[PDB]
């Protein structure tokens, strides 16, 4: 790893992206009904996003807390965890963020080609039911943030350590979806799926 801060512009790009991706994941994995969703133009393309103000504020609050951590390159993973009725995870959408040595050599340029680069992640999420089985009815979600070895930003939006039950998933299928290697970060999106559910 290198140690370079992403800076504000990159942090804000990633948070705006993560917001869209969460909405899209909730839609395609049917965590919430299609009825609370209306299309919005994001990255020059119609993406389904929730019109439910409280769900929206929750996703927004979550990412507002992640943003300063991103700015300082202190985030290793942001994970959208889908939990069944027994609060056991059935699916994880992992956004793994790294900055390997020599990253920037022959890399893409996120800021210059935002829509181009991120739209591919949108496409992959939107068709990922091709490589997953249907989830059980009654699933919920949460967001887990893995911090680097070396967040309570908002009034009345506290964070706590996740429990083992949030994280334990036996025998997971791994499906890589998309990787982006840009000037100052690498982001890999992949899904972990519970074997039988």
């Amino acid at each position: 790893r290198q140690d370079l801060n992403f800076g504000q512009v990159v942090a804000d790009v990633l948070c705006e992206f993560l917001e869209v991706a969460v909405h899209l994941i909730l839609y395609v994995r049917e965590v919430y009904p299609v009825g609370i969703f209306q299309k919005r133009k994001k990255y020059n393309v119609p993406v389904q996003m929730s019109c439910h103000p409280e769900l929206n504020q929750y996703i927004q609050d979550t990412l507002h807390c992640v943003k300063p951590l991103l700015e300082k390159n202190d985030v290793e993973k942001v994970v959208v965890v889908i939990l069944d009725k027994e609060h056991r995870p059935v699916e994880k959408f992992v956004f793994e963020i790294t900055q390997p040595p020599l990253l920037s050599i022959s890399s893409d340029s996120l800021l210059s080609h935002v829509e181009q680069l991120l739209a591919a992640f949108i496409l992959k999420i939107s068709v990922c039911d091709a490589v997953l089985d249907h989830n059980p009815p009654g699933c919920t979600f949460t967001v887990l943030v893995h911090t680097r070895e070396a967040i309570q930003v908002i009034k009345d939006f506290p964070w706590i350590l996740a429990d083992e039950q949030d994280v334990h998933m036996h025998d997971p299928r791994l499906i890589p979806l998309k990787t982006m290697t840009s000037d100052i970060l690498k982001m890999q999106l992949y899904v972990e799926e519970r074997a039988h559910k």
């Binding site: 979550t62 967001v143 887990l144 943030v145 893995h146 680097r148």
Partner: peptide
């Protein structure tokens, strides 16, 4: 290193 999660639950609809 966490992982950390929001204490509040995701809203039900």
């Amino acid at each position: 290193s966490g992982p950390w999660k929001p204490a509040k639950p995701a809203p039900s609809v």
